[PDB]
Amino acid sequence: FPEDSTFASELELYLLRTQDAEQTGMTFVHQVGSTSLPVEARVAKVDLAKA
């Protein structure tokens, strides 16, 4: 590793990491003369840590 310089006496690390919702959920099977059905509820979440 090479070298750096900060002009500060302490260094902190913050890591914001996100687990987004995957684009699963294929498509419902229809027939031409009927009404549709609703799409299920997804989940997304965030998380953040410190060193």
Partner: protein, 48 residues
Amino acid sequence: DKIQLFRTIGRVQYWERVPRLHAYGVFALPFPMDPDVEWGNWFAGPHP
């Protein structure tokens, strides 16, 4: 016998569709059909 006078070949009856009220609203959903039913004579005929 060269002439072979006029005959008919085929006939077609075309009806309309089943009428219904515009303002009462539609609500339909598909269903699987029962295989143990002779579905041929339930759909036979050009009539609404």
